[PDB]
Structures are given as structure tokens and as C-alpha cells.
Amino acid sequence: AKLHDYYKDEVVKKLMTEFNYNSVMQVPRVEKITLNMGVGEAIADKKLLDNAAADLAAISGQKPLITKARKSVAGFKIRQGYPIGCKVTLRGERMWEFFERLITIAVPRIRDFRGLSAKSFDGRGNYSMGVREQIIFPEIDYDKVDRVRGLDITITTTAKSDEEGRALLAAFDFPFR
């Protein structure tokens, strides 16, 4: 909520002076944060997915989608339409609420932290983080989980390049290397 109001007032005005944008809409805005959790090991144990679903449902506000396998492959021993991973495509109000909660308190709680990767862009301003543990978020109780599982955060923007997209995230006091 607050970071959205901060973005509208403080950030845009900062970003306009950098690349001398003609219009206010030209500034890159954060479209959606997609929290993904390819549990994978759900082939053997079916409940292990439903455990991950509860952990994503705890981490994010909303309940996750159970993504099916797109195509059958023998390397992992999976078939067409088999539930292999969990996902959340959170956007809008709860997105800005989660984005605060990620960068302000969770990212600090990473074990052996130093500085997040600057090179990690797709060549179109869309960022992604790979958190190893679930414990870094304060939602999960310590004596509840019993697996070293994690998720990946995926920040989608309206930017046309990583050089342009880095500034947007950098304006939120985001930690880079």
C-alpha cells in the first residue's frame, strides 16, 4: 500500500530526470510478482505438494495454483497433466504489500547474505530472485515445516531493457551487488 503511494510520488519523479521521458506513462511500472515453487518430489509423495501449497498460501496472501506438467519426459519420470509444482501470480494491491514484506524484512533474513545479483535480468527488465529457504519469511512457524524447500520470486515489469529496468527496482532501495 505505502510503496505504491511512494512509487507514484517519489520514484516516478526520480525516474523522469534520469532518461528524460516525455510522458508519465513512459516510466517502467511493476506489473506482477510471480512466486513459483516447483516442488517436483510430489511424484513419490502426493501430500508433499499440498504441504508446499500451504507454505505458499502462508508466504503469499492468496492460495496457489497447482501447475500441471506441460509434456511427458522420461528423465524425471513424469506424464502429461501430472501436478509437478505450485505457483502464485499475485498482482495489484497484495503485490505491493508482499513486495514491501519481501525487500524490507525477508531479504535481510537470508542466511549468508551479501548482495543480490545485478546481472540477473532477462534482457527485458524482468527480475527474479531465488530464495533457498522458506524460513526467511516470518509467516512459517519453525516447528511446522520439515523439509529444506524454497521458492523463486519473479518480478515482471513494463520495461523494454534491463538497463532501464534496473533503475526502477534500484529506486525502491533494493539491494544490488
Binding site: 500500500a1 498460501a57 502462508a58 496472501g61 504489500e97 514491501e100 514484506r101 525487500i103 524490507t104 524484512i105 531479504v107 535481510p108 533474513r109 547474505f113 551479501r114 548482495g115 516470518p138 509467516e139 532501495d173 539491494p175
Partner: peptide
């Protein structure tokens, strides 16, 4: 001190934040 919205329960207690972390 910092109010937020999440599926925790009643209250929170933290070690570090975006401020005060040694980076």
C-alpha cells in the same frame, strides 16, 4: 516499528531489516 499485512497472527519480532543490516 513498522505495520504490515500478512498471514501470521497477532504480533511479530525481527532480528534485522532493510535498514540496520550490514551490507
Amino acid at each position: 516499528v513498522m505495520k504490515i499485512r500478512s498471514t501470521v497472527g497477532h504480533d511479530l519480532n525481527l532480528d534485522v531489516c532493510s535498514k540496520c543490516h550490514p551490507f
